[model samples]
Target chain A: MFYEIRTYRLKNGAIPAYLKVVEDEGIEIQKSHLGELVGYFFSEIGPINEIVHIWAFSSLDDRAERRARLMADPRWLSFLPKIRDLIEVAENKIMKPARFSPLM
Target chain B: MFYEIRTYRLKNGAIPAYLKVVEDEGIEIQKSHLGELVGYFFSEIGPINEIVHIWAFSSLDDRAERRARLMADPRWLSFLPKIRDLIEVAENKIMKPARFSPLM
Candidate 1:
């Protein structure tokens, strides 16, 4: 399986509102297209206000297709603006699981 | 619960070797001491050769104590050098679970 790890460095002190919006209105919309929600987290140490979440996909093609579908959803499009201003720097990494990984 | 999210940017093209050594020698020792293994992964898309893993702890004190125990273990100490030079930058973040997280 391939893993998509997305890290976002949110604007200063914006985590609480970001988390609230996601939990209240964003994540379910995301999970509907993203497939598996491996984990979702917000920072407590190191880089403050950072958020990280992982999603698992069967293949790169699957990931692309799923993301396309999510983007096309008007609900998701509307959801984007709710958190857009809160994010400062957004980083994304797609990863392959090790043979022995429990997640794999 | 608290989460320890560690992100490592390995030297370019060093992921294969790094994953090999960690799978063979490091993770088991880590899991034995660290308690819960939330997820472990190596990058595929955005940042190449980056490794990210999350571990769960009951509390901040619990995390500190377990980390100290891992460092004191000879096996974990020796296992460090096998992949030390492969890493370029290491970052760590501590996070708390949002009320709606599945991992929580």
Candidate 2:
């Protein structure tokens, strides 16, 4: 399987607002199309105001197909701006699990 | 719970060596002291030659205590250089799970 780590650096004091919105409305929508939700988090000790979320996919093809579906949804599109305005920077990477890793 | 996400950028073509040593000798020593293992992974896209691992702890105090024990262990210290020499850059951050996260 492949894991995608997406991190966002939010405006100062924006984590609570961003997370709240996602908790109330966005997460379900994301989970509906994304399929597997590994974890979602916000930074505490290093690089404050940053949020990181992990999603597991069977492969890059799976990731692209699922992501495209999410983007095409009007509901998801409508909800995008609620959290987008709060983010200052976004970073993402694709990872392969170590053979001995629990998730692998 | 708090999750410590640590990322290491390895020297070019060093991933196999790094992971081989960790899988064969280092992981068991790490797991013995670290307690909770979330996941371990290496990059496939974006930034290549990187390894990322996550561990969860009850709090920062728990983290410090366990880390000290791991560092103090002679076995762990002896194994450190086997993997340390392969790393070019290391970055770490502490994260708190989102209320709706699976791991939370």
Candidate 3:
């Protein structure tokens, strides 16, 4: 599967707020449509305010449809602004998982 | 498992060399001591020249201990310098697993 690493760099000292909101609300909003949650992370040792979440899709078409639906949802719209300004940079990179990779 | 997201930003056009060495030699040495091989990924999008490997451990000590052994490994020592210069920046970040995450 191809994995999508959705990363966000949070503003200074805003990690806790973003985490709290995601824990209480946002996560499930996309979970149902995002396909797979390989892992979610917040930096600990370097680049401290960044958060990264990994999700997998079988194909590009599958990935496109999933995100299309998530974005089209009104509930996702409400969740968007919750952390919109908290993020300074947003990036979505694709990666191919090796067969030996455990998370797959 | 607790996770470590280790990322490397390679020198311009050095990605192929870095990946070749890791798969041809380094991965096996690391797999023998490092924690679980969560995944080995090469960028398919975004910054375009990055390599990310995710590893898991049962505890902090488990991670430190395994890494300690690898650091002292002659094979790893040899493997280190191979891509050491190819990497412009290296980052190792610690992160906690989400309670509902399957990776745990």
TM-score of every candidate's chain A: 0.97, 0.98, 0.95
Interface RMSD of each: 1.3, 0.6, 2.0
**Alpha carbon deviation, residue A9, candidate 2 (Å):** 0.9
Stretches > 4 Å off in candidate 1: none
lDDT of each: 0.88, 0.93, 0.84
- Against the true structure, whose TM-score is highest? 2
What tens digits encode model 2's per-residue C-alpha lDDT throughout B2-103?
999999999999999999999999999999999999999998998989999999999889889999999999999899989878999998988999999998
Query: In order, how many clashes per candidate?
Result: 2, 0, 0
Better candidate by TM-score, 2 or 3: 2
**lDDT tens digits, residues B1-104, model 3?**
67898888899898788778887899889999985888888778777688899898898898999999999999999999999899998878788766556677
Model 2: how far residue B63 lies from native, Å: 1.2
Using DockQ as the measure, which candidate wins?
2
| Predicted candidate 1 versus true structure: per-residue lDDT over A1-104, tens digit per residue | 99888889999999999999998899999999999998888877777888888889999899899999999999999999999999999877788777767788
Writing each residue's lDDT as its tens digit, candidate 2 over A16-71 gives 99999999989999999999999999988899899999999988898899999999
Distance from true location, Cα of B61 in model 2, Å: 1.2
lDDT of each residue in A1-104, candidate 3, tens digit only:
88898888999899888888887878888899897888887766677798888899999899999999999989999898999999999889888865456645
- Report model 3's chain A TM-score: 0.95
Where is the poorest 10-residue window by lDDT in model 3 chain B? B95-104
Give the Å error, residue A12, model 1. Answer: 2.2
Q: Per-prediction RMSD in angstroms?
A: 1.7, 0.9, 2.3
lDDT of model 2, residue A85: 89
Note the residue pairs that clash in candidate 3: none
